[PDB]
Amino acid sequence: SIPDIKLSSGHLMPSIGFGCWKLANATAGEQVYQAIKAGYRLFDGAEDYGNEKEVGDGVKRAIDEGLVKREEIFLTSKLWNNYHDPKNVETALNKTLADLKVDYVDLFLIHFPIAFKFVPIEEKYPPGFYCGDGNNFVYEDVPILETWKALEKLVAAGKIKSIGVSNFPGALLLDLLRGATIKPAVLQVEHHPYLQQPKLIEFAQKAGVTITAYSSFGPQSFVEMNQGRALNTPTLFAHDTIKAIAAKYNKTPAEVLLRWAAQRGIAVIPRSDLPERLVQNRSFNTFDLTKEDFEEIAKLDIGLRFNDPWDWDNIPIFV
Amino acid sequence: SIPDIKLSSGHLMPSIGFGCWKLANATAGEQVYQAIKAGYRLFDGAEDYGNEKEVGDGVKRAIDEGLVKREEIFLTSKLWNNYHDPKNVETALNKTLADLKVDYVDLFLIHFPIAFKFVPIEEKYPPGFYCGDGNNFVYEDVPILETWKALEKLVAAGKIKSIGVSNFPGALLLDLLRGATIKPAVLQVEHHPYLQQPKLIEFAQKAGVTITAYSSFGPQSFVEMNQGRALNTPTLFAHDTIKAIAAKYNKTPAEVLLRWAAQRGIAVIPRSDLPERLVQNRSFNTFDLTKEDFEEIAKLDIGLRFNDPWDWDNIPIFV
Numbered sequence A, B: 001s002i003p004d005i006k007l008s009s010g011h012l013m014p015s016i017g018f019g020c021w022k023l024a025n026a027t028a029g030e031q032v033y034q035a036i037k038a039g040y041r042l043f044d045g046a047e048d049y050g051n052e053k054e055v056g057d058g059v060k061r062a063i064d065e066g067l068v069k070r071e072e073i074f075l076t077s078k079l080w081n082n083y084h085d086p087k088n089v090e091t092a093l094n095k096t097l098a099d100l101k102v103d104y105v106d107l108f109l110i111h112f113p114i115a116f117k118f119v120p121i122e123e124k125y126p127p128g129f130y131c132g133d134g135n136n137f138v139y140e141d142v143p144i145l146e147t148w149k150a151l152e153k154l155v156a157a158g159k160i161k162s163i164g165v166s167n168f169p170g171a172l173l174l175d176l177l178r179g180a181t182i183k184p185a186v187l188q189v190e191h192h193p194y195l196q197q198p199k200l201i202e203f204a205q206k207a208g209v210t211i212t213a214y215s216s217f218g219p220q221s222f223v224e225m226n227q228g229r230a231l232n233t234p235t236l237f238a239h240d241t242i243k244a245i246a247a248k249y250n251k252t253p254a255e256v257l258l259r260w261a262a263q264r265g266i267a268v269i270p271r272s273d274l275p276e277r278l279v280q281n282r283s284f285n286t287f288d289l290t291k292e293d294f295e296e297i298a299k300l301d302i303g304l305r306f307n308d309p310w311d312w313d314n315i316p317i318f319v
Ligand SMILES: NC(=O)c1ccc[n+]([C@@H]2O[C@H](COP(=O)([O-])OP(=O)(O)OC[C@H]3O[C@@H](n4cnc5c(N)ncnc54)[C@H](O)[C@@H]3O)[C@@H](O)[C@H]2O)c1
Pocket: A018, A019, A020, A021, A022, A044, A045, A111, A166, A167, A188, A213, A214, A215, A216, A217, A218, A220, A221, A224, A254, A255, A269, A270, A271, A272, A273, A277, A280, A281, A307
């Protein structure tokens, strides 16, 4: 019932996944296990989330019960910023493999086109914004392509099935495609009605790159983190346009928000934090949005970005 | 006196220049010569403008009369898109050198982070959007850094004094700063009240990269091209905000648009097509805009871009 998308790498990827950001370490295992019982097979993780051991526990618990086999589970992870230097990429990936308790990860993405100064895993892990010098941000001169080549070698070694990037603007993706031997199979970016970036989506899809949307519910995820920008933003759940469309099809605003992406070939990985939401978030492909629906939703676009490195240390990624 | 900006390269660059885009071949020489008589020293040229031979004629004449020494003239040229492949870089720069009739150019910029398929100079020059296959666009897999390294060698070889980029968004500029040995001394971008990109400007200036603005008069130069977007755009010259400020100081709207950039450390290169414009376009630094003036002009920013490769062939540079 959950459609798969064939990636450029030849591997299938579930179009609907389970987000693991802000998934508390204490109950992450149980929640992953429950998600698997509810039918989820793709888990979107990241070294930065610091809960890869638990995610690992959940998957293993499901495997040991005979519910699923490793091959039916799609595990996504992401190379954090301090590990872009080629000599540290495998180190970081091994940490991920060890925590997840697997021989390979299905998708490994460059979390951000940002290279923080390397911080040994034994000193702090996950490092987050720590760059080895108090509260100061420190960067290292590592071109993206260098990192990508290190990733390509790890695909050859069998440690990763497919590789991709996250938070890459068009200019940067274009350039990477110029020096890439294995084409980035996935582009994962913030995508919701307030930040539609239709041209980036079009370019990427036409390039054979698969889009995975994050923060499909817009400001919600950031409101939970008390971010001022998200708090000041009218929610998509209560937006007149989203509610009217939801009423038109007798669906929920959340379902419309996920379908809006799904119907255009974009993969989603909503964060489900309630049993009810677990079900709702994988049962929205029960209707089709019309051309007029898309045009109405299109008006919501205002280039409002919630996940922006500009906010951390004026990193010009999206300027 | 036209103030100078010290580039990161150590060389001085006039803060006010003479644009050479659309400068007619038949009169380009005389026009540059007159500009030199009027005091201009920097000339913003480009292989794509198809008039470097004539721009050179103009400079040579000024020198042959003892008006100025090569030492005093600042020549900027740009590497066109068909010449990114490293093996074609020096040949393109040579063609530029011969045309301008000089041993070196003061500034050589990668015109666009776009790499068209090579087209021999003898087959067509300038090639423009021609890629060797009728009206089709054909690209080469040459990462920016490969092109940049070629440029660096040419600096070592004494054929270029300073190198830089043009039409580079922040993420791409950042990645390049990670691979460059010689840092980009200049970032030349479309810049006017409808496309202010304040964060990009901020980022670049803090990195020591000098900003050179083009199309300081907004839709104006593109209207001269019968461009739809520019034709449907209220002119900056008749905009209430600009009109009001100009009146307040008894200045023309054009002087306010030029000072708006200058006061912020941004170099300008207006296209002067009339003797009086020629003089005025280099004499506007006689007043300062106030904090409020800047605040009023800031409200004009709508990220409206007139020079976008997305229009050529949906090239994702600015998405
Ligand atoms: N690569 C990146 O930079 C990046 C950044 C952010 C998130 N991600 C990934 O993508 C996922 C995106 O999720 P997100 O955390 O941004 O948030 P969403 O997935 O934006 O969900 C945000 C919040 O809305 C609520 N919600 C979820 N389903 C709902 C429903 N059916 N009805 C009402 N409310 C509902 C929950 O409270 C949840 O915390 C993450 O978990 C993570 O795996 C990646």
